[PDB]
Amino acid sequence: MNILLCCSAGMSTSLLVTKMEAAAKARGLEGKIWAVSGDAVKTNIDQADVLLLGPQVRYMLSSMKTLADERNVGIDVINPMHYGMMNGEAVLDHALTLKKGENLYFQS
Ligand SMILES: [Cl-]
């Protein structure tokens, strides 16, 4: 489960990535969880299974969605409460939900 976060690797987002990594390890989940600035998404999206945007870059969703949909990568904006309260277990769940729903047997 590879989870790409956009669009900054500042204190807050990086703290969340660390918490998301602790949560994934504690479910013996292998994969890469990493944050990049917006200019790096194109070169990192193919490795990702899910792309998650910080609440402060919600305005980039429409444009990032076109790319993600095209690449078969789940995409969503992180819930402001999960982000502000640094709930890594919750954001990992969000990502897992996007990936699972995305492969849903009935259609797409
Ligand atoms: Cl950054």
Side-chain angles (χ1 to χ4, degrees):
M1 180 73 181
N2 294 344
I3 304 166
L4 180 61
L5 283 68
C6 197
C7 299
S8 92
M11 195 205 324
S12 291
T13 303
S14 298
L15 187 51
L16 181 64
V17 173
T18 292
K19 303 188 78 60
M20 290 176 72
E21 284 185 325
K25 188 191 178 192
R27 305 179 197 181
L29 208 66
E30 289 185 15
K32 182 185 187 185
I33 298 174
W34 74 123
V36 300
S37 66
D39 54 314
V41 174
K42 276 164 183 179
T43 42
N44 285 270
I45 190 84
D46 293 304
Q47 184 170 28
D49 291 307
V50 176
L51 173 60
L52 290 186
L53 307 196
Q56 62 276 63
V57 294
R58 175 175 307 269
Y59 69 90
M60 302 182 77
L61 180 60
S62 304
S63 168
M64 289 285 178
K65 173 182 159 50
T66 299
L67 179 62
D69 286 359
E70 186 201 346
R71 301 279 100 199
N72 284 314
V73 171
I75 186 172
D76 206 359
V77 180
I78 299 168
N79 177 320
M81 272 193 163
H82 301 162
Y83 191 90
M85 306 300 300
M86 289 288 133
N87 193 338
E89 293 270 340
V91 180
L92 174 60
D93 281 357
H94 189 170
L96 290 174
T97 298
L98 287 178
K99 175 52 182 293
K100 167 183 165 63
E102 178 178 357
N103 302 356
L104 181 147
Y105 35 101
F106 278 100
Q107 186 61 210
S108 60

